[PDB]
Amino acid sequence: DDMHMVIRKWLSSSVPNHKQMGIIGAVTMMGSVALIECDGQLSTLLDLVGFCCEQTPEVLALYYDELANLIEKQKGNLDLQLLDKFGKSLVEDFPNDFVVDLSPTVDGSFLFPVKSLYNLDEDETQGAIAINLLPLVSQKRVVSPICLSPCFRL
């Protein structure tokens, strides 16, 4: 945890890299806590991870991917309560990133709307259509942590 405290510098940004290595180390040290006194050093050195995640870029997506790899690697262990404390605010960021609407046949603006005229690709196996993966994809410019692939993996 002092190495990741050193990675706190890495997480802060030593160079063009080391922020990535920070989150790989952070989630790896986190999964060792998944199977108190060390719960406080966990959350303080987690808030920097949330900070770099709160910073705009794909460094949030990497935090998502890493939590996905942690659930994938240790499945029988890692009880539900500990990981729920870790991610329930990262899971629930997908189905409300944009999909809270009612009639998805409209376009809104759907910025750069090439598929305002042909939306709603072929699945049809549902009973509601709120935005259905369209509106976050509209504006898109995302690294698909945004109700998309790395977030769906978690």
Binding site: D47, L48, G50, F51, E54
Partner: protein
């Protein structure tokens, strides 16, 4: 409060900070780097 001041900052109790209050004025100051 102010960025160089004392009362809301670590320098309020730094006039009588001790070896135990060393990493206490440095605790609230140490909180100002997360996020």
């Amino acid at each position: 409060a102010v960025v160089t001041l004392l009362l809301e900052k670590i320098p309020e109790f730094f006039f009588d900070v001790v070896g135990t209050f060393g990493t206490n004025f440095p605790r609230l100051i140490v909180n100002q780097f997360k996020w």
